[PDB]
């Protein structure tokens, strides 16, 4: 449901709004960016819908869209136009103007469109372009840079500049600025590549009333224009409905299948024209017309029906354009409320110490930047940068590195078929010759077969020309002659190495009679021989019955039910003398008469060699593999059973749904197929009917379904979204233009193609196999584990520095500029860059990393680590007090004036080691990363930083001038501090190990989580309790 709000404008109100939002402060514009309803309520007054210059579109969800006039008032909401009909006073989508008109209307539209009516319809429907708006750099900056965390980083930088902390301020500013500029460049480049992708400019021929034909640009098309399709064929600019002639279309855009499709003229009648009902008379936008024949009339005619975003390609692009981290933000919000508490406490104690109010507020605001680290997102992006580099080395190109963390949460991967799991093109399984009238065993490689009539039939009965020093034409005959091993020289042929034979005459292949025939002769022969190739079934009806076996039909169905593409061949001895002086005057009706079936050649879409190992690895690690294809259900089911998606022992149950006509409801029919546990194999129409009429039974279909065939691109997108609504993390591997909406909607969409799909997909694989799915899943599990470790380290670092600065505020001192800089830059940047370094484990496991940063393991680790940290720091500070040589810190003046002092020296000496200890403690190895001892840069960095800090503590006068450290002469106390921090080094590792090993078992033993909150897990449980299809 949609609600519209009519808001006209008032100039005095406009200037008032501008001044009150600009001169007062920048906060109002920001909060209105958060909620535009208040902004549009204050800025513009409510008016009637007949005078509105602004709309508030609610879906609630707030969008605002300005009503534009050309008169005809319209607005564009998510690409789809809505015009203003003055008569009935409403905004009607343009798709619904001519919706529901009869086939006789489309046929009447065959004469053309008057140029004035073309102007009216170009005003209404707009130009026939799929326009992507490429925003300018300020337009992207106001969208991105105003991120709440970039605002917090700007506040932190301003405060640090106000606090003489210029160096870390500069580092954070440079990091955030370069990250922002890189993201703006990436976003603009993606928008530009998409706009270059969907762009289609070409000259088309349109009929005009009175018999005139004019060539207009493809953008000047409007629903009603009568396209005149070229005979040689070309790309399709707009959804048209054939009103004359026939076409052969390459619909690999819609179906992902390069197989030619026959489109016939729309049948005249008084029935509503429908893209779904009349799909065989509709030419879709983006699909390539191979050839168009005009039997009656001078040229083939098509009547435009949808243009722009109304087309199928337009709908897919509109879906593309207009579709842990949450726990991370929740934890930084908890850190923020802890910041508020610590800040009010700091105000209290700093006022107790007679600190001036300016420095009081400076310190109290600086504690906020202390405990809420402004360098957390960069620290957590370093690991994804490492993973992106490793993927680029392996051939997989990720455009947004933070999308790699989603590869580690995957519970389900949806797979294309043609081009992703199976080879792009057909390959010949073999040929089955005939000896008399009984079939012979399948000959897998036709070349070994002796030199007889059927072999020359395979090698010569085809229409392909020699150009670019390569045979070119229809792929099936190409691959068949490639298998026979013969090299071609009407036209002459040479054997592999067995006499050269030349074809004398050839007849064209027409899809009406659905076969082609040639006549051939060679020297030393008796008389010219004819060859016939085409459909398997009908040519058997042409040959004599005593030549075709009686078991022809059942064998043909056994081949076809497996997804094969069978073609039959026959020959003829011609009593005419061997010379083309009489051979090319022959009528082919004589050829297809009295035929004798030689044999059937079978071609099947081979599976890639790298498909079955990857599918069995995914199914071994408890990752669901789904096949969402655009091919028929028989081929999809055969490939699924053959690529390991359906193991030989598992049950496949076809789901069939009949759309309810008048007088009956909708039905589901389950028929099993003989050779989790049950897989459901349902078509595209069945999926649509289950979505619409059976929304109760859709979750069980999505949980059990494995094979989704005949799926339209919008249906693949809908399936990915419906699976994600079951709280799946859906990955999608495809290589076609039909896979684009799914690769965009999927959590991890991987594209094997370099055209039309690398744009929308986050990942693009340079290889053609699905070997890139386990690679991305391993890198994603590694990046997720590493981002967990880096977040735990940054949390423990911020909390340790919070405690160290509270202990020093309480006694009227502080860490100081250079100790702060050491801790913030030298230790923390080194640690957070070299933690994120170690790569993924070499093998996939059945258990995936946790996806919640608020887990009881994570929070328990942070709590106990910080208890140990504050214990060690307070122990060191209080043993400092019990010493005889200890003297107070001259509280009358505040830091950095009273530095150096023993309190600061001891707190810094302990805290500096604690940062390295926590760094090493939170880092993990198996099962998702390589063991930590392989991270030799990290271990060497920890050793070197620990050596520097031990030199600070022990070696006198070493870096105690710059860092402002008091020199402790008592060697016993220095050794006691070192023993205390070694106690901490042992305790941190023992705590981490004990937690990781015991807390899962203890949590299982104390509070058994008998119910999973994931929706698909509840569905799986209730299905195991009671199977849905009996």
Ligand X SMILES: CC(C)CCC[C@@H](C)[C@H]1CC[C@H]2[C@@H]3CC=C4C[C@@H](OC(=O)CCC(=O)O)CC[C@]4(C)[C@H]3CC[C@]12C
Ligand Y SMILES: CCCCCCCCCCCCCCCCCC(=O)OC[C@H](COP(=O)([O-])OCC[N+](C)(C)C)OC(=O)CCCCCCCCCCCCCCCCC
Ligand Z SMILES: CCCCCCCCCCCCO[C@@H]1O[C@H](CO)[C@@H](O[C@H]2O[C@H](CO)[C@@H](O)[C@H](O)[C@H]2O)[C@H](O)[C@H]1O
Q: Which does 961 bind (CB under 5 to 8 A by kind): ligand Z, Mg ion, ligand X, none?
A: ligand Z
- Exposed, middle or buried by CB within 10 Å (0-12, 13-18, 19+), for 289? buried
Smallest separation (angstroms) from Mg ion to the CB of 684: 15
Smallest separation (angstroms) from ligand Z to the CB of 961: 5
543 or 918: whose CB is closer to ligand X? 918
381 binds ligand Y (CB under 6 A): yes
950 binds ligand X (CB under 6 A): yes
Pick one of 948, 954, 958, 1019: the residue that binds ligand Z (CB under 6 A): 948
- Exposed, middle or buried by CB within 10 Å (0-12, 13-18, 19+), for 156? buried
Q: Which does 736 bind (CB under 5 to 8 A by kind): ligand Y, Mg ion, ligand X, none?
A: Mg ion
Q: Which x/- pattern over 167-186 shows residues binding ligand Y (rule: CB under 6 A)?
A: -------xx--xx--xx---
DSSP secondary structure letters along 144-171: HTT-HHHHHHHHHHHHHHTTT-HHHHHH
Q: Which does 695 bind (CB under 5 to 8 A by kind): ligand Z, ligand X, Mg ion, none?
A: none
83 or 899: whose CB is closer to ligand Z? 899
Beta carbons within 8 Å of 562's beta carbon, 6+ residues apart = 604, 634, 635, 638
Pick one of 247, 302, 303, 379: the residue that binds ligand Y (CB under 6 A): 379
Q: Is residue 79 within 8 Å of residue 24, measured between CB atoms?
A: no
Q: Which stretch binds ligand X (CB under 6 A): 201-209, 803-811, 845-853, 942-950?
A: 942-950
Phi-psi region of 427 (alpha: psi -120 to 50; beta: other; left: phi over 0): beta
- Judged by CB under 6 A, the number of residues near ligand X is 30
Query: Both tokens of residue 805?
Result: 């600065």
Smallest separation (angstroms) from Mg ion to the CB of 639: 12
Smallest separation (angstroms) from ligand X to the CB of 992: 10
Smallest separation (angstroms) from Mg ion to the CB of 569: 30
Smallest separation (angstroms) from ligand Z to the CB of 330: 33
Residue ranges binding Mg ion (CB under 5 A): 256, 416, 418-419, 736
Site for ligand Z, residues 235 to 294, rule: CB under 6 A: none
CA nearest to 391, candidates 923, 799, 765, 853: 765
973 binds ligand X (CB under 6 A): no
190 binds ligand Y (CB under 6 A): no
Strand partners, 289: 249
142 or 940: whose CB is closer to ligand X? 940
End-to-end Cα spacing for the chain: 38
**How far apart are alpha carbons 736 and 722 in whole angstroms?**
21
Annotated binding residue at 739? yes
Between strands 301-306 and 470-472, the pairing is unpaired
Its sign, for the CA torsion 24, 29, 30, 31, is: positive
961 binds ligand Z (CB under 6 A): yes
Site for ligand X, residues 797 to 816, rule: CB under 6 A: none
Pick one of 243, 421, 776, 833: the residue that binds ligand X (CB under 6 A): 833
**How far apart are alpha carbons 670 and 732 in whole angstroms?**
27
Q: Which does 925 bind (CB under 5 to 8 A by kind): ligand X, Mg ion, ligand Z, none?
A: ligand X
Smallest separation (angstroms) from ligand X to the CB of 465: 46
Q: Which does 182 bind (CB under 5 to 8 A by kind): ligand Y, ligand X, ligand Z, none?
A: ligand Y
Q: Which stretch binds ligand Y (CB under 6 A): 377-385, 588-596, 811-819, 899-907?
A: 377-385
608 or 679: whose CB is closer to Mg ion? 608
**DSSP-based three-state secondary structure for 63:** strand
Pick one of 518, 832, 844, 895: the residue that binds ligand Y (CB under 6 A): 832
Site for ligand Y, residues 384 to 413, rule: CB under 6 A: 400-401
Residue whose structure tokens are 């010569």? 460
**DSSP-based three-state secondary structure for 461:** coil
Q: Is residue 750 within 8 Å of residue 765, measured between CB atoms?
A: yes
Strand partners, 44: none
Smallest separation (angstroms) from ligand X to the CB of 921: 8
Phi-psi region of 834 (alpha: psi -120 to 50; beta: other; left: phi over 0): alpha
945 binds ligand Z (CB under 6 A): yes
**C-alpha distances in Å from residue 824, one per residue of 374, 540, 681, 818:** 11, 83, 57, 10
E strands along 253-297, which residues? 260-264, 282-283, 288-293
E strands along 379-494, which residues? 396-398, 412-415, 427-435, 438-439, 465-467, 470-472, 487-488, 491-494
**How far apart are alpha carbons 515 and 569 in whole angstroms?**
10
357 or 944: whose CB is closer to ligand X? 944
342 or 736: whose CB is closer to Mg ion? 736
Q: Which x/- pattern over 802-831 shows residues binding ligand Y (rule: CB under 6 A)?
A: --------------------------xx--
Annotated binding residue at 589? no
Query: Both tokens of residue 445?
Result: 């490689």
Beta carbons within 8 Å of 830's beta carbon, 6+ residues apart = 941, 945
DSSP secondary structure letters along 94-124: GGGSSTT-BHHHHHHTTS---HHHHHHHHHH
Site for ligand Z, residues 792 to 831, rule: CB under 6 A: 818, 822, 826-827
847 binds ligand Y (CB under 6 A): no
753 or 800: whose CB is closer to Mg ion? 753
Q: Which stretch binds ligand Z (CB under 6 A): 356-364, 459-467, 742-750, 955-963?
A: 955-963
**How far apart are alpha carbons 49 and 54 in whole angstroms?**
9
171 or 463: whose CB is closer to ligand X? 171
962 binds ligand Z (CB under 6 A): yes
Q: Which does 926 bind (CB under 5 to 8 A by kind): Mg ion, ligand Y, ligand X, none?
A: ligand X
747 is catalytic: no
**C-alpha distances in Å from residue 328, one per residue of 172, 180, 722, 877:** 20, 20, 26, 33
Its sign, for the CA torsion 385, 387, 393, 396, is: negative
154 binds ligand Z (CB under 6 A): no
Q: Directed axis angle between helix 902-922 and helix 828-835, to 10°? A: 10
Pick one of 265, 566, 625, 821: the residue that binds ligand X (CB under 6 A): 821
393 binds ligand X (CB under 6 A): yes
314 or 401: whose CB is closer to ligand Y? 401
256 or 536: whose CB is closer to Mg ion? 256
375 binds ligand Y (CB under 6 A): yes
- Judged by CB under 6 A, the number of residues near ligand Y is 17
E strands along 676-797, which residues? 678-682, 705-708, 730-734, 748-751, 763-765
CA nearest to 429, candidates 596, 616, 567, 325: 567
829 binds ligand X (CB under 6 A): yes
329 binds ligand Y (CB under 6 A): no
CA nearest to 815, candidates 892, 879, 887, 873: 873
CA nearest to 571, candidates 521, 511, 513: 521
918 binds ligand Y (CB under 6 A): no
299 or 400: whose CB is closer to ligand Y? 400
Which of the following is catalytic: 416, 631, 817, 824?
416
Q: Which stretch binds ligand Z (CB under 6 A): 392-400, 609-617, 793-801, 956-964?
A: 956-964
What residues are designated binding site? 735, 739
Residues that bind ligand Z (CB under 6 A): 818, 822, 826-827, 945, 948, 959, 961-962
What residues are designated binding site for Mg(2+)? 735, 739
Catalytic site positions: 416
Residues that bind ligand Y (CB under 6 A): 174-175, 178-179, 182-183, 375, 378-379, 381-382, 400-401, 828-829, 832-833
């Amino acid at each position: 449901s949609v609600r519209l709000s009519g808001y006209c404008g008032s100039p005095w109100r406009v200037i008032g709004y501008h001044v009150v939002v600009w001169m007062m402060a920048g906060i109002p514009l920001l909060l209105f960016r958060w909620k535009p309803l208040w902004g549009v309520r204050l800025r513009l007054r409510p008016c009637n819908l007949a005078h509105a210059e602004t709309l508030v579109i609610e879906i609630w969800q707030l969008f605002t869209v300005q009503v534009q006039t050309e008169v005809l008032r319209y607005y564009l909401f998510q690409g789809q136009r809505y015009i203003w009909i003055e008569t009935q006073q409403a905004f009607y989508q343009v798709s619904l103007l001519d919706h529901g008109r009869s086939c006789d209307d489309v046929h009447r539209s065959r004469h053309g469109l008057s140029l004035q009516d073309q102007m009216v319809r170009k005003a209404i429907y707009g130009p026939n372009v799929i326009s992507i708006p490429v925003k300018s750099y300020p337009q992207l900056l106001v969208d991105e840079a105003l991120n709440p965390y970039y605002g917090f980083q700007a506040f932190s930088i301003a405060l640090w500049l106000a606090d003489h902390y210029y160096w870390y301020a500069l580092c954070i500013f440079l990091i955030s600025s370069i990250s922002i500029c890189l993201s703006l460049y990436k976003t603009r480049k993606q928008s530009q590549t998409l706009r270059d992708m969907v762009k289609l400019s070409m000259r088309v021929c349109v009929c005009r009333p009175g018999g005139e034909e004019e060539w207009v640009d493809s953008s000047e098309l409007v629903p009603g224009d009568c396209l005149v399709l070229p005979q040689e064929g070309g790309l399709m600019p707009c959804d048209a409905a054939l009103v004359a002639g026939e076409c052969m279309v390459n619909e690999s855009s819609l179906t992902g299948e390069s197989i030619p499709v026959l489109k016939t003229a729309l049948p005249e009648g008084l029935g509503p024209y429908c893209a779904e009902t009349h799909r065989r008379h509709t030419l879709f936008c983006g699909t390539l017309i191979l050839q168009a024949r005009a039997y009656v009339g001078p040229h083939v005619l098509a009547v435009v029906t949808r243009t722009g975003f109304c087309t199928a390609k337009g709908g897919l692009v509109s879906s593309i354009l207009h579709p842990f981290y949450k726990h991370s933000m929740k934890f930084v919000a908890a850190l923020s409320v802890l910041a508020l508490l610590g800040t009010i406490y700091s105000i209290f104690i700093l006022y107790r110490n007679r600190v001036p109010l300016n420095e009081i507020v400076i310190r109290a605001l600086d504690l906020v930047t202390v405990v809420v680290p402004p360098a957390l997102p960069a620290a957590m992006t370093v690991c994804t940068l490492y993973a992106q580099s490793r993927l680029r080395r392996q051939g997989i190109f990720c455009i947004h590195p933070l999308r790699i963390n989603l590869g580690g949460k995957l519970q389900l991967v949806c797979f294309d078929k043609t081009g992703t799991l199976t080879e792009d093109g057909l390959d010949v399984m073999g040929v089955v010759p005939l000896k008399g009238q009984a079939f012979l065993p399948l000959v897998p490689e036709p070349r070994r077969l002796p030199v007889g009539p059927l072999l020359r039939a395979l090698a010569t009965c085809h229409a392909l020309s020699r150009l670019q020093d390569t045979p070119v034409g229809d792929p099936m005959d190409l691959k068949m002659v490639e298998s026979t091993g013969w090299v071609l020289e009407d036209s002459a042929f040479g054997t592999q190495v067995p006499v050269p034979v030349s074809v004398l005459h050839r007849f064209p292949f027409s899809s009406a009679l659905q076969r082609m025939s040639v006549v051939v002769a060679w020297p030393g022969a008796t008389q010219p021989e004819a060859y016939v190739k085409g459909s398997p079934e009908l040519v058997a009806g042409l040959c004599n019955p005593e030549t075709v076996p009686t078991d022809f039909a059942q064998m043909l169905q056994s081949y076809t039910a497996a997804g094969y593409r069978v073609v039959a061949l026959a020959s003829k001895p011609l009593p005419t003398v061997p010379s083309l002086e009489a051979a090319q005057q022959l009528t082919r009706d004589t050829v297809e008469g009295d035929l004798s079936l030689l044999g059937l050649l079978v071609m099947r879409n081979l599976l890639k060699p790298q498909t079955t190992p990857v599918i069995q690895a995914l199914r071994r690690t408890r990752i669901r593999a789904v096949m969402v294809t655009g091919d028929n259900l028989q081929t999809a089911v055969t490939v699924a059973r053959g690529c390991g998606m359906v193991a030989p022992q598992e049950h496949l149950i076809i789901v069939h749904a009949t759309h309810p006509e008048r007088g009956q409801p909708a039905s589901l029919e389950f028929l099993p197929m003989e050779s989790r546990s049950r897989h459901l194999a349902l078509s595209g129409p069945t999926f649509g009917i289950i979505v619409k009429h059976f929304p109760k039974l859709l979750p069980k279909v999505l949980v059990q379904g494995t094979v989704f065939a005949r799926m339209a691109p919008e249906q693949k997108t809908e399936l990915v979204c419906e699976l994600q609504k079951l709280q799946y993390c859906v990955g999608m591997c495809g290589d076609g233009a039909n896979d684009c909406g799914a690769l965009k909607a999927a959590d991890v969409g991987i594209s094997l193609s370099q055209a039309e799909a690398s744009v929308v997909s986050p990942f693009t694989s340079s290889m053609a196999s699905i070997e890139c799915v386990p690679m991305v899943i391993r890198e994603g599990r590694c990046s997720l584990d590493t981002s967990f470790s880096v977040f735990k380290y940054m949390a423990l670092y911020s909390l340790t520095q919070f405690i160290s600065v509270l202990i020093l505020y309480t006694i009227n001192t502080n860490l100081g500029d250079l100790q702060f800089l050491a801790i913030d830059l030298v230790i923390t940047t080194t640690v957070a860059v070299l933690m994120s370094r170690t790569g993924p484990a070499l093998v996939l496991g059945r258990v995936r990393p946790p996806g919640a940063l608020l887990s009881v393991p994570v929070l328990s680790s942070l709590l106990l680590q910080m208890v140990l940290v504050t214990g060690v720091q307070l122990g060191g500070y209080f043993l400092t007090l019990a010493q005889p040589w200890f003297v107070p810190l001259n509280r009358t003046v505040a830091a950095p004036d009273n530095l150096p002092n023993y309190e600061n020296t001891v707190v810094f000496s302990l805290s500096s080691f604690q940062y390295l200890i926590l760094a090493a403690a939170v880092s993990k190895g198996a099962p998702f990363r390589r063991p930590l001892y392989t991270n030799v840069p990290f271990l060497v960095a920890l050793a070197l930083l620990s050596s520097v800090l031990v030199g600070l503590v022990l070696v006198p006068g070493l870096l105690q001038g710059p860092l402002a450290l008091r020199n402790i002469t008592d060697t016993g106390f220095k050794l006691l501090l070192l023993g205390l921090v070694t106690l901490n080094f042992v305790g941190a590792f023992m705590l981490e190990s004990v937690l990781d090993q015991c807390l899962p078992a203890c949590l299982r033993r104390l509070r058994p989580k008998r119910a999973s909150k994931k929706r698909f897990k509840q569905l799986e449980r209730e299905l195991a309790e009671q199977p849905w299809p009996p």
